[PDB]
Write a protein that binds this DNA or RNA. Structure first.
Ligand SMILES: NC[C@@H]1O[C@H](O[C@H]2[C@@H](O)[C@H](O[C@@H]3[C@@H](O)[C@H](N)C[C@H](N)[C@H]3O[C@H]3O[C@H](CO)[C@@H](O)[C@H](O)[C@H]3N)O[C@@H]2CO)[C@H](N)[C@@H](O)[C@@H]1O
Ligand SMILES: [Mg+2]
Ligand SMILES: [Mg+2]
Ligand SMILES: [Mg+2]
Ligand SMILES: [Mg+2]
Ligand SMILES: [Mg+2]
Ligand SMILES: [Mg+2]
Ligand SMILES: [Mg+2]
Ligand SMILES: [Mg+2]
Ligand SMILES: [Mg+2]
Lengths: 123, 183
RNA sequence: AGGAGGUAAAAUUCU
RNA sequence: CUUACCACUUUGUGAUUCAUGACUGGGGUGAAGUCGUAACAAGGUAACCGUAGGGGAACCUGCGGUUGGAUCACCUCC
RNA sequence: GGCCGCAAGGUUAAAACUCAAAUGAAUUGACGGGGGCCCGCACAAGCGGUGGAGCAUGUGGUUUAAUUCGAUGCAACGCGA
């Protein structure tokens, strides 16, 4: 529009949508499991998807996915939470990291087990 | 006459309380409480029916809870049946006894949970109080149709009270120890 | 060959 | 010793702002529940906008406004 | 929140939250309780039937130790036989 308009009300710029208030923009926060749900995924998919509600460090009560075949944790559990999302089940916005300070890693992983905190068989 | 609604009022009441007892059975306290699982929807290989018809819902301690079973080819089949059922119980497949732990009263549990039972208690009272309302509506009604004597009314309007009062005592004192399972 | 006026009543649904 | 300045603090009374609240209002989302069928074909009463009054619910009804509206074949007369 | 209204409400005007769509015009079909035109024992016009009855035969269900398997609107059911 007018230059005389732009001068008067200059060009706006969208700001941070941030899809993950891990408050201080942190790569991960530490939290306690409020509880450990199971809920069912969005439309075309069907499963029992494992998950936990987690108070962390900064006051935020949130809710995170716990992935991999077979996890083990309960109330007492302090987990480490990292930025994440699951397309099914829209509630989510967060993934629990496997092999951080309490939840443990996946039983009997070999492929891609950096991602599930698993020590090597015996190399 | 009064007779067959004095006994009618009565059954409706002490079966009112035996729903409360029944719905403060589906809560999770600290304590083991096997009647927690002993009212859970579960599938297995043909038809519903609870796990009553399969495993012994026993104990290991106040804070844990063994599941002695017969058949070891449905351990995951029920595990999911239990571990997706509005409780929040992750069962360990330590083998043999599906170890279901009892995570502690987290204080935001000693409270707010407690608030639920003494609310569920209250509505159980209200139901009773309303059996009351009816019971003697029938009384009051069959009076203004001259089939009772004022006296016979009065002695029936109370005594219906005696039924409410006692029936509440059961609600209240069944709640009261159930409160100890956290306080 | 224009205009005119009158000609179908109601009747749902499909992991 | 006193006088002036003045920090801390005090009383009243407004303002402003963040967190919190029984309860409560809608909103969002969640494969297979319950009602009816409002809309899209003329959607079987054209729809829709503003407004107002009704109603389990989609909605219905009046007042104006918009096309972002489907149909001219058969008849009797001219 | 401000301003305006007797009210109904009007005006200025966000946020958390959620989705990977939402939208426009045109295209090809398909549909319409849209319209035009036209066919077929489709109606209409007629003749004799099933549906009732007994029996033959098939099928569903029920039964059974078994009542072997298949065919299920038109286009399965005197069909594979
Ligand atoms: N989803 C958006 C909203 O949907 C609303 O409609 C809500 C309900 O009407 C609708 O419920 C539908 C029901 O309408 C439909 N006729 C039958 C269906 N079983 C229900 O489904 C609902 O419940 C089932 C299980 O109970 C859930 O799996 C599913 O997430 C949910 N859609 O689900 C919607 C909410 O999930 C309104 N259309 C409106 O407020 C808004 O558009
Ligand atoms: Mg229809
Ligand atoms: Mg229906
Ligand atoms: Mg609500
Ligand atoms: Mg309709
Ligand atoms: Mg209409
Ligand atoms: Mg109108
Ligand atoms: Mg012919
Ligand atoms: Mg004929
Ligand atoms: Mg015949």
């Amino acid at each position: 529009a007018t230059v005389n308009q732009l001068v008067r009300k200059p060009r706006a710029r969208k700001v941070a949508k941030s899809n993950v208030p891990a408050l201080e923009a942190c790569p991960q926060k530490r939290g306690v499991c409020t509880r450990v749900y199971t809920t069912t995924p969005k439309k075309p998919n069907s499963a029992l998807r494992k998950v936990c509600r987690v108070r962390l460090t900064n006051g935020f009560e949130v809710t995170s996915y716990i992935g991999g075949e077979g996890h083990n944790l309960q109330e007492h559990s302090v987990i480490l939470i990292r930025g994440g999302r699951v397309k099914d089940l829209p509630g989510v916005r967060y993934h629990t990291v496997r092999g951080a300070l309490d939840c443990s890693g996946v039983k009997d992983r070999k492929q891609a087990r950096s991602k599930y905190g698993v020590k090597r068989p015996k190399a | 006459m009064i007779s067959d609604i004095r006994k009618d009022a009565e059954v409706r009441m002490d079966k009112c309380v035996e729903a409360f007892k029944t719905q403060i059975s589906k809560i999770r306290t600290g304590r083991a409480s096997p009647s927690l699982l002993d009212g859970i929807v579960v599938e297995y290989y043909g038809t519903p029916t609870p796990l009553r018809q399969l495993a012994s819902v026993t104990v290991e301690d106040s804070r844990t809870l063994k599941i002695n079973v017969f058949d070891r080819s449905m351990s995951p089949a029920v595990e999911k049946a239990i571990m997706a059922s509005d409780l929040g119980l992750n069962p360990n497949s330590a083998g043999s006894d599906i170890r279901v732990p009892l995570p502690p009263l987290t204080e935001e549990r000693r409270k707010d949970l407690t608030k639920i039972v003494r609310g569920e208690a209250e509505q159980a009272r209200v139901a009773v109080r309303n059996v009351r309302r009816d019971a003697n509506d029938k009384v009051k009604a069959l009076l203004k149709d001259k089939e009772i004597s004022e006296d016979d009314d009065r002695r029936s309007q109370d005594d219906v009270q005696k039924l409410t009062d006692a029936a509440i005592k059961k609600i209240e004192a069944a709640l009261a120890d159930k409160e100890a399972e956290l306080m």
